[PDB]
Design a protein around this ligand. Structure first.
Ligand SMILES: [Mg+2]
Ligand SMILES: [Zn+2]
Ligand SMILES: [Zn+2]
Ligand SMILES: [Zn+2]
Lengths: 196, 263, 168, 49, 65, 133, 85, 114, 141, 43, 159, 559
DNA sequence: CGATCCTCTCGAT
RNA sequence: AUCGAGAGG
């Protein structure tokens, strides 16, 4: 994530050759979607990138402190003084073909954070395993090799669909399921099942 | 001579600025791609750690070791270990480096790429000597030691391509520009008032004639004449990054031609 | 005029026009008897209920009252000819299409409608922003809306926050 | 760089979370609901520090 | 947490320029901008590498063992 | 077969409504004092100005996968400068005698009005627009 | 007791989505358990795809007992039930 | 953990062969060559050179998924011309072009002083 | 020397605060269009001045570049996430025996800082990297 | 860590709202999303 | 208020009309006021519509209400859905709420009502009044681990 | 509740979700390791014996393999340990618990599952890497973004259980929602954005790309369409090549505003025999709109056909855009020097309006209407002058943005962003409210201690005069912060409240289903509706249709 | 007697 | 297991 409430998982890794490139030969370490911008309205993110680009060029720390008189225009002036189009845009060539892109890419340095929650500490699959003692139901948690909970909300979904037998298998074959002997008179779990 | 043409503007020990005139864009780019990913080089692929009383972790150190540029001049004389018939490695497929450093002085002791030493039989081919451009002569700073601090490790440097791991990249960035005046209209300049005033004029604009407005759009024109600057890390010289680039590509196009007769 | 009804007739017509390559110059091979009776017969065939009895027959008749309105307004003598310019081939194809599409459009016994409706209201309720409204510009627009209102409705609120009488 | 301010209870670092309480000895008046018989109320949360 | 060998973006060797960089600042009394360019770090990806580096090893080395 | 319509037009207006490559042309026939033409032209490929006198032709000849020119001996029905291919979509009779045709050249629209078009232009997936001088 | 005769059958002549999903399921189950196949499996091997063919060619020998709310039922043979959808 | 070995990008597996010729189901004299353990470096370069052939009616390539190295190249030629030969000619033309470039850069490099 | 004073909300009630020292009290009598619109003098009976408006924020929020240019929740969101971002929690990490310890190989000091980061020890123990980012539609992954 | 050591908890008329009086005292941004939003504060 | 009403020519026309809005309800009295349109009078209090105009009007108003909540949110739900909910509350003769007070107090299977709320106490008077569970509810068959009579299981398959 | 209506279950997997432009709508990208854990109990029949044998021989560690072999008398053979794991001569009637393979039906879900569309049957596609992968067009019914979400996967263990999924729960068969009688899946983001760009009259593509784009469509007939232009260049339009993704017999008409069969501005839509004639393709055409390509395609061609459509449309657009590119910079929030001058003066005239009204209120010259306070009116008035100001300021800004403006572009396509977004970012954020009213005097007669007592002015009671571009002042910041919070507070409330509502609705109507006599009844068999929805029609099979006898003049009716 | 779903981790008795 | 805290969407 960026310092602007911009959560994001790696969708894919591309090697240098497949990456869009600058005429200088610069290439991104990261590609964020333009669609994650207009709704969120996190303008500071775009400004940070602008300022940070001038910072790396001039070899000066960027003043991204709040209540100041640092303007986008003022930063844009200095970036142009470096031979780059003032609003962060840069001509980029497609890694696959080498052809120029019809769109110029707003590209520059942006401080990104490597957060907790990594696929590998999260993946979990279970296909029969540890059963709780009382309930005789699959145990809880990835850590204990547990069974995922097919809650009522999920039960309701299946009903809607009209899948009577998938709902039965989910609640019997996977999870629970037991064979009890009933008295045809009192109808209770009394019967002393002396099998064999 | 015949097809693709070259005019070298600038030439250095680490950079080559040249024009790739009378060439297809698919060719200019595939060349740029091979220049990045596919030229084989020599890089450390195995670290056996005997001692580590350092501030840094085993694998942290092992990783930086992989990144140190090593002489790759005679890389084709060295074999890929996966092709070699030896059990594991030898001198036909690998170069063996040693690193031993101890905090002798009270003052912080630095560990450079100069401190790595070749143990393996080189068989007189220019290979494995860590690349040094540092004026002082002590290449890359691997590590720093205090006092009781020690580091004893053995490295196995192997042939490989960037396509497997970036350490095997013989070059840094390749600069690449075509049509500095946008006469091909391959891009559509984003502006506020004037595209011309807002977009900085290209270095290579001097090398081409400006569009001239009193003329219709050249619809038939194709992209030829490519302004390029290939920069090498030093493992291989710059002339070689481009020649070996051509070769690698020539060789991979040849493998297809050969696969057709094979089937 | 616009109301959710099964069988998109506009599309059936468009499809017949393309399928049969209708030409706006050549005069149709249709009759008033063909169009007038044709539509009338199609109506007797748009089944929803089946039992031979009066109650179930009147139930059926009622169930298709509105669709038949659309059907008539769309497939009327002048429109069929002056507008659509159908041929007897294209016209009979249109009739069999509606007959089929309608019978498909019917609900299947077994459909778990109760849950469906409950989820159908629940889902968009969780998409509700502002327990107030955007009517905040005027200080005479204060009416219980959003989730608190839906909460009032469902609980059958004796003491509602915004009781209002709209006098005509 | 460690700032302290925490404890070490059985080798575990503990932080006492600042507890927000309504200040005592403060006199406050409150209007009371339409069904309620008392119109307004004056309260005092008298405590000895 | 020591001077990365090679710039993540392009790969230009940067793990041999740190001590040189520090000297240019202290001894030559230059500024970071002109210092980076004197080391031949023309591109900003290569610039952020050294400029933005925090050398925590100097701190870790201070620990007695 | 051959030609379906062929006339000389006088361009009144040429509007690039928020487009850089395309322009909507407004023309009337030099001959008939009723014949209209409103058409989207790619000005980047063939520019058009005001009062420009242009020869417009609608043919149906020079079906299967498109083969690149390959002018090894290839002779196409053009002595023209600008040629499009399109589809007919509406035939609006603007009352009494005045009739109009609608052609989309992959979204580049065209509307030709007059009368004498009659027994030629049909709901053909065909129609090649050819423009010269 | 209880039933409904073949004549005077008010339920849909058209098979429900639920009817065919349960029908294909039950058949796919039989096929998977080495039960005989009543159609020439043209290059086919999947039990559901085989049941689908068996339904397409109307050779599934099963009957839907259509219960009404009062407890009464209407027996419809897969063979007679129309399969539009 | 579910990440495949990087050598799988350029090294052939068990049963894996470089080219796989499959005659196209729809078009006549059209063929689909499946290049295994190959990216845009060869696809684009071959596809581009195939367009330069006047008797080539169609030539397009694709990478159906980025996880896997393989790419598909569709070639359609004129009556009498075998697309395998069209690919053959394309390959040689590329090889010849590369040779010239090698020699010309070599010739130039030898003049450049530094 | 009584040049500064400690004020609680109860007392804050009885006082008049100027935001800026300069911009809030010199004299009155062209403008930068780019610069934000700031209201005139109006009230001029000041008893105190704000030491620095950026001080209204705490630890997590003092790390955000230009929060004054962001929608209000994005600032709450980042405050929750900064606490989940790896860095160098302490120099003695190599010496502590703790349940989970996440340490960034080569942490980078941000190219875009807040004046508050000097006291927050951020450029000394950073938690993140200065990635070259492209906002672009590419493979659509 | 720093942030943890400067946390406030408020147990149980409008406790969750960023009150005017919080100016310069409690952080306007720093608060958990849901459950204890506005109840858990940072100085 | 704005009003779409037919003109003498036949087409619908916009005709603005004066309407009175009230903070408070006394339907019984206000409807019998001279000068008003008693056939048109409305209240968001559907409970008052239920007492004054009857159950069917109660149902009608109850839908108009549920509708307006969804509508205001710019959202659209198919009539039949809300229609069903509204009828469920209605079929009882009065207004049965979707709370443990309302719907859950019904004659439905003891095991199905306990699945909602007041779990134990529902099952307590189930034993006390000696209730017979129909076992026709989704919930009972979910508890019993049997194929519920839901779409797929709403019919028996024969040979 | 925790053990009976819901319970923990076997054959269940979970992980982080990721976007896949190369996966099919109905597919799900299952990580090898997961597929390797989860099994299907497959009975041995001559049809599978050869595949099953090889699989039992592949083992539990090589993917297209298995763990466990069940024989007669019920005993399990653990393939990872068994000495005879290398042996095993399979018998018919035995079971092979095989690894989850490509094209198996799987129940895929995202919690909260308040929709039947929240649980769908997917086609397994065993892939490398650790994330579950899905087609971006299945994002909405699940309500999932890839910001760190996790999804749940379930495996049917029976032949009828796998049939129930593929015949009733399958993604293509859920495309058209019965909830809102419109589709519940459409074209989104890059695809929605690129499609607009590709479908411009100005968008002209050539041979090289055309051929590539054509090949990209799997179902492609192999016929190169005739270029719309055959003059100095064989040049195709975007509309042309995209029309390739559209199947034959597809007819679509719209008419928006300017739309006149000659569509001057390229508005509305016209598609005949699956070929776009005019009109730029955006959200109205290609979104989950009532009368869009998708509702038409599903009802005309079929679910499986429509499902394929997404992929085809994705494949072309995605590719075209991959090569065209699209960004968003700081420059896209920047409005003209003259525009800002106008925006600034627009707010300034609102300020006077408020002040003059304040002067009027303070003079007792204010005369409030019936039913509301002299103050209640004042506040409502000021609130209005200030909202108007922001709307007008924002419109001034919106009008200044060119068609090259990336933010304007996203709005135009309908991918991301609305007016307010432009307005707040580039001209003026506007007034902030808490509890409906504007910023309150939390301090005695003051919103903040930087203000004088009794100040009702815009700036004082929370009016943010600045844009996010210009930046907010400390006061503006704190006030924006106050309203910001209310949003988060009631977000938390709204989610926990609606959650309870949902359950009570679901419990109340659980047992309501259409019986074999078209009746709608509960578990007691009590009539709720005599004909479902009063017409006995299924909700998905319906759509808004114009009844032509009701409208128009009696003159036009007769005509 | 109710007051969102699901999920992860850790600590203590 | 229980009880509790923190966290993710
Ligand atoms: Mg999410
Ligand atoms: Zn008994
Ligand atoms: Zn060897
Ligand atoms: Zn670099």
């Amino acid at each position: 994530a960026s310092r602007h409430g911009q959560k994001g998982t790696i969708g894919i890794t591309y090697r240098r050759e497949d990456m869009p490139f600058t005429a200088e030969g610069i290439v991104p370490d990261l590609i964020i979607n333009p669609h994650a911008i207009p709704s969120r309205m996190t303008v500071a993110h775009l400004i940070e990138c602008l300022l940070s680009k001038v910072a790396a060029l001039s070899g000066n720390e960027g003043d991204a402190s709040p209540f100041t008189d640092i303007t986008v225009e003022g930063i844009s002036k200095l970036l142009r003084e470096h031979g780059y189009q003032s609003r962060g845009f840069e001509v980029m060539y497609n890694g696959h073909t080498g052809k120029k892109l019809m769109a110029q890419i707003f590209f520059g340095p942006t401080y990104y954070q490597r957060l907790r929650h990594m696929v590998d500490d999260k993946i979990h699959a279970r296909a029969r395993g540890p059963m709780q003692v009382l309930t005789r139901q699959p145990v809880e948690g990835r850590s204990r090799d547990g069974g995922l909970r097919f809650g009522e909300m999920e039960r309701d979904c299946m009903i809607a669909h009209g899948a009577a037998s998938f709902l039965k298998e989910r609640l019997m074959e996977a999870s629970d399921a037991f064979r009890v002997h009933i008295c045809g008179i009192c109808g209770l779990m009394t019967v002393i099942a002396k099998l064999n | 001579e015949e097809g693709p043409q070259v005019k070298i503007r600038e030439a250095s020990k680490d950079n080559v600025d040249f024009i790739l005139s009378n060439v297809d864009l698919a060719m200019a780019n595939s060349l740029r791609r091979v220049m990045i990913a596919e030229i084989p080089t020599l890089a450390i692929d195995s670290v056996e750690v005997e001692t580590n009383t350092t501030v840094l972790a085993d694998e942290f150190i092992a990783h930086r070791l992989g990144l140190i540029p090593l002489q790759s001049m005679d890389i084709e004389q060295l074999e890929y270990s996966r092709d070699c018939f030896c059990e594991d490695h030898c001198d036909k497929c690998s170069v063996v480096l040693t690193l031993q450093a101890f905090g002798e002085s009270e003052s912080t002791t630095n560990v450079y790429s100069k401190d790595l030493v070749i143990v393996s039989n080189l068989m007189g081919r220019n290979i494995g000597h860590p690349i040094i451009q540092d004026k002082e002569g002590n290449g890359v700073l691997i590590c720093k030691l205090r006092k009781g601090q020690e580091l004893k490790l053995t490295c196995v440097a192997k042939k490989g391509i960037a396509k497997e791991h970036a350490k095997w990249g013989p070059a840094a960035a390749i600069e690449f520009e075509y049509d500095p005046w946008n006469k091909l209209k391959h891009t559509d300049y984003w502006y506020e008032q004037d595209s011309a005033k807002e977009w900085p004029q290209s270095k290579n604009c001097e090398y081409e004639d400006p569009p001239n407005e009193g003329d219709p759009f050249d619809y038939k024109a194709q992209a030829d004449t490519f302004y390029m600057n290939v920069e090498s890390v030093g493992s291989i010289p710059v002339d070689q990054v481009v020649v070996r680039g051509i070769d690698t590509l020539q060789k991979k196009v040849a493998s297809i031609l050969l696969a057709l007769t094979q089937m | 005029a616009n109301w959710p009804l099964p069988v998109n007739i506009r599309r059936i017509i468009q499809n017949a026009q393309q399928t049969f390559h209708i030409d706006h110059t050549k005069p149709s091979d249709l009759t008033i008897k063909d169009i007038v009776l044709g539509v009338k017969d199609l109506q007797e065939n748009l089944l929803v209920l089946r039992g031979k009895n009066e109650i179930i027959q009147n139930a059926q008749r009622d169930a298709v009252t509105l669709f038949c309105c659309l059907l008539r307004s769309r497939l009327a003598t002048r429109r069929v000819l002056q507008e659509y310019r159908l041929t007897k081939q294209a016209f009979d194809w249109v009739l069999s299409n509606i007959e089929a599409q309608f019978l498909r459009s019917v609900v299947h016994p077994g459909e778990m409608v109760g849950v469906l409706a409950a989820q159908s209201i629940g889902e968009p309720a969780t998409q509700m922003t502002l327990n107030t409204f955007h009517f905040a510009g005027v200080a005479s627009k204060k009416v219980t809306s959003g989730v608190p209102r839906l909460k009032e409705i469902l609980n059958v609120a004796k003491n509602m926050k915004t009781p209002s009488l709209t006098v005509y | 760089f460690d700032m302290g301010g925490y404890f070490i209870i059985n080798g575990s670092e503990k932080v006492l979370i600042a507890q927000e309480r309504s200040a005592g000895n403060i006199v406050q008046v409150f209007k009371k609901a339409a069904p309620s018989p008392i119109s307004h109320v004056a309260e005092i949360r008298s405590a000895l520090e | 947490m020591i001077v990365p060998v090679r710039c993540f973006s392009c790969g230009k060797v940067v793990g041999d320029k740190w001590e040189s960089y520090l000297n240019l600042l202290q001894e030559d009394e230059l500024d970071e901008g002109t210092a980076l360019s004197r080391l031949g770090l023309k591109r900003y990806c290569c610039r952020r590498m050294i400029l933005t580096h925090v050398d925590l090893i100097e701190k870790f080395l201070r620990y007695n063992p | 077969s051959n030609t379906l319509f062929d006339d000389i037009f006088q361009v009144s207006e040429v509007d690039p409504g928020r487009y850089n490559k395309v322009c909507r042309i407004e023309a009337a026939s030099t001959t008939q004092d009723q014949c209209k033409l409103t058409l989207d032209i790619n000005v980047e490929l063939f520019p058009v100005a005001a009062q420009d006198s242009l020869t417009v032709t609608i043919a149906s000849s020079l079906t299967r996968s498109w083969r690149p020119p390959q002018a090894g001996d290839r002779s196409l029905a053009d002595d023209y400068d600008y040629v499009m291919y399109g589809t007919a979509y509406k035939f609006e009779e603007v009352s009494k005698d005045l009739i109009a045709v609608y052609y989309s050249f992959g979204g580049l629209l065209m509307r030709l009005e007059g009368n004498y078009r009659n027994l030629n232009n049909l709901k053909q997936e065909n129609a090649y627009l050819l423009i010269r001088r | 007791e209880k039933a409904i005769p073949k004549d005077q059958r008010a339920t849909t002549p058209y098979m429900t989505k639920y009817e065919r999903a349960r029908i294909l399921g039950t058949r796919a189950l039989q096929i998977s358990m080495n039960a005989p196949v009543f159609v020439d499996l043209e290059g086919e091997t999947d039990p559901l795809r085989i049941a689908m063919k068996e339904l397409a060619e109307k050779k599934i020998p099963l009957v839907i007992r259509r219960y009404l709310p009062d407890g009464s039922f209407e027996d419809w043979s897969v063979e007679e039930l129309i399969v539009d959808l | 953990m579910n990440a495949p070995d990087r050598f799988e990008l350029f090294l052939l597996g068990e049963g894996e062969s470089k080219l796989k010729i499959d005659p196209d189901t729809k078009a006549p004299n059209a063929v689909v060559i499946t290049f295994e353990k190959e990216d845009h470096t060869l696809g684009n370069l071959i596809r581009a050179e195939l367009l330069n052939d006047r008797k080539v009616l169609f030539a397009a390539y694709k990478v159906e998924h980025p996880f896997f190295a393989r790419f598909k190249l569709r070639i359609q030629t004129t009556e009498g011309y075998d697309p395998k030969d069209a690919l053959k000619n394309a390959c040689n033309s590329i090889i010849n072009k590369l040779g010239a470039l090698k020699t010309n850069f070599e010739t130039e490099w030898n003049l450049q002083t530094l | 020397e009584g040049l500064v004073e400690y004020i609680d909300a109860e007392e804050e009630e009885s006082i008049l605060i100027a935001m800026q020292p300069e911009d809030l009290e010199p004299a009155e009598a062209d403008v930068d269009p780019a610069k934000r619109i700031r209201v005139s003098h109006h009230a001029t009976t000041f008893t105190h001045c704000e030491i620095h408006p950026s001080m209204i924020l705490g630890v997590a929020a003092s790390i955000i570049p230009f929060p004054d240019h962001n929608q209000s929740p994005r600032n709450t969101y980042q405050s929750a996430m900064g606490k989940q971002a790896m860095g160098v929690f302490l120099t003695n990490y190599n010496v502590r025996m703790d349940t989970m310890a996440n340490i960034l190989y080569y942490p980078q000091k941000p190219l875009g800082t807040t004046r508050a980061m000097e006291y927050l020890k951020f450029r000394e123990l950073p938690a993140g990297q200065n990635a070259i980012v492209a906002i672009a539609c590419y493979s659509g992954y | 860590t720093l942030s943890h050591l400067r946390r406030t908890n408020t147990p149980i008329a409008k406790p969750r709202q960023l009150h005017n009086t919080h100016w310069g005292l409690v952080c306007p941004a720093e608060t958990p999303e849901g459950q204890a939003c506005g109840l858990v504060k940072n100085l | 208020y704005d009003r779409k009403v037919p003109s003498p020519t036949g087409e619908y026309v916009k005709e603005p009309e004066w309407v009175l809005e009230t903070d408070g309800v006394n339907l019984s009295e206000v409807m019998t006021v001279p000068g008003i349109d008693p056939t048109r009078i409305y209240t968001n209090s559907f409970i008052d519509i239920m007492e004054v105009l009857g159950i069917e009007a109660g149902r009608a108003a109850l839908y108009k209400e549920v509708y307006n909540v969804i509508a205001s949110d710019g959202s659209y739900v198919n009539y039949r859905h809300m229609a069903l909910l509204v009828d469920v509350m209605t079929t009882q003769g009065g207004l049965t709420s979707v709370t443990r007070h309302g719907f859950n107090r019904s004659n439905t299977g003891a095991l199905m009502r306990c699945s909602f709320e007041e779990t134990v106490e529902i099952l307590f008077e189930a034993g006390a009044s000696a209730e017979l569970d129909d076992c026709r509810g989704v919930s009972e068959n979910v508890i019993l681990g049997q194929m519920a009579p839901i779409g797929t299981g709403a019919f028996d398959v024969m040979i | 509740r925790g053990n009976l209506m819901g319970k923990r279950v076997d054959f269940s997997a979970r992980t982080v979700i990721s976007g896949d432009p190369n996966l099919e709508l109905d597919q799900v990208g299952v990580p090898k390791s997961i597929a390797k854990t989860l099994t299907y109990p497959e009975v041995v029949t001559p049809y599978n014996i050869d595949r099953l044998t090889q699989l039992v021989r592949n083992g539990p560690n090589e993917h297209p393999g298995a763990k466990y072999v069940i024989r007669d008398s019920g005993d399990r053979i653990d393939l990872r340990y068994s000495k005879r794991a290398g042996d095993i001569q399979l018998q018919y009637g035995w079971k092979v618990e095989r690894h989850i393979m490509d094209n198996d039906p799987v129940l895929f879900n995202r919690q909260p599952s308040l929709h039947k569309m929240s649980m769908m049957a997917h086609r397994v596609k065993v892939i490398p890497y650790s994330t579950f992968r899905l087609n971006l067009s299945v994002t909405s019914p699940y309500n999932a973004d890839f910001d760190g979400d996790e999804m749940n996967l379930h495996v049917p263990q029976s032949e009828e259980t796998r049939a129930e999924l593929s015949q009733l729960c399958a993604v293509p068969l859920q495309i058209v929602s019965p909830q809102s009688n419109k589709p519940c899946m459409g074209i989104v983001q890059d695809t929605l954005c690129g499609i607009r760009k590709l479908t411009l009259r100005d968008t002209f593509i050539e041979l090289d790309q055309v051929l590539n784009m054509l090949y990209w469509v799997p179902d492609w007939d192999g016929v190169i369409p005739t270029p719309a232009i055959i003059k100095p260049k064989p040049l195709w339009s975007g509309k042309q090549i995209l029309s390739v993704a559209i199947p034959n017999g597809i007819h679509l008409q719209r008419f928006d505003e300017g739309t006149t069969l000659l569509s001057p501005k390229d508005n509305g839509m016209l598609i005949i025999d699956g070929q776009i004639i005019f009109g730029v393709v955006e959200k109205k055409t290609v979104g989950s709109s009532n009368g869009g390509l998708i509702h038409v395609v599903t009802r005309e061609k079929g679910p499986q056909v429509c499902a394929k459509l997404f992929g085809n449309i994705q494949k072309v657009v995605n590719f075209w855009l991959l090569h065209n590119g699209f960004s968003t910079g700081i420059g896209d929030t920047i409005a003209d020097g003259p525009t800002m001058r106008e925006i600034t003066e627009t707010i300034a005239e609102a300020k006077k309006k408020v002040l003059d009204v304040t002067k009027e209120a303070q003079a007792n010259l204010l005369t409030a209407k019936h039913g509301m306070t002299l103050r209640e009116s004042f506040e409502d008035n000021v609130v209005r002058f200030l909202n108007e100001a922001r709307d007008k300021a924002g419109r001034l800004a919106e009008v200044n943005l060119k068609d090259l403006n990336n933010v304007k572009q996203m709005v135009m396509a309908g991918s991301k962003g609305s007016f307010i977004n432009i307005a707040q970012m580039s001209a003026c954020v506007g007034q902030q409210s808490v509890e409906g009213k504007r910023i309150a005097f939390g301090f005695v007669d003051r919103t903040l201690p930087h203000f004088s007592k009794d100040d009702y002015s815009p700036e004082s009671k929370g009016f943010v005069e600045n844009s996010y571009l210009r930046g907010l002042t400390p006061q503006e910041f704190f006030f924006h912060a106050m309203g910001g919070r209310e949003g988060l507070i009631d977000t938390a409330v709204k989610t926990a409240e609606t959650g309870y509502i949902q359950r009570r609705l679901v419990k109340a109507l659980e047992d309501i289903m259409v019986h074999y006599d078209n009746t709608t009844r509960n578990s007691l068999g009590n009539v709720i509706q005599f004909i479902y929805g009063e017409d006995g029609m299924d909700a998905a099979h319906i759509e808004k249709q114009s009844l032509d006898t009701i409208g128009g003049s009696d003159a036009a009716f007769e005509k």
